[PDB]
Design a binder for these strands. Sequence first.
RNA 1: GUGCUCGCUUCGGCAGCACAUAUACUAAAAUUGGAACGAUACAGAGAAGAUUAGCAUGGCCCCUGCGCAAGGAUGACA
Length: 89
Amino acid sequence: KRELLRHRDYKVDLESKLGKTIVITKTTPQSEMGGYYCNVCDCVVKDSINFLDHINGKKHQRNLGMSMRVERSTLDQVKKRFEVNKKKM
RNA sequence: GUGCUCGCUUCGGCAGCACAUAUACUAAAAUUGGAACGAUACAGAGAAGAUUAGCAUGGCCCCUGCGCAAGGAUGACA
């Protein structure tokens, strides 16, 4: 039982820690280590684009109970999305 | 199905007759798994002897001292 893949509604904080230096000792955990950390995956990745590859990967989405299948939206959903933005602006 | 029986029988039909004789990895679809030497991260002298300083031992030749063994020549009246 795997749910369908859902588009992330939150922006990714790839740029958040530019210039912010991290002093790394032996006792420091992977959470505060340099780079990007998948709290769901418990893995460290040291690129923004490689972290994006991770959070777009089969294993990361599997750990979230997802799959590599995207919902097939219908006519009314797209039309109502159009009307929703028309109302919002 | 086509055509034919001097058949029943009517052109509405029926019974029999000649030919037709055994296709398919068969598949459209089902699903969950395991996965780089590709990137970034680290290191990166990515080919050398893996050394040189003394003293003592060992070999050869003298010199000196002590010991052992066997010896050579010489010296001393009252």
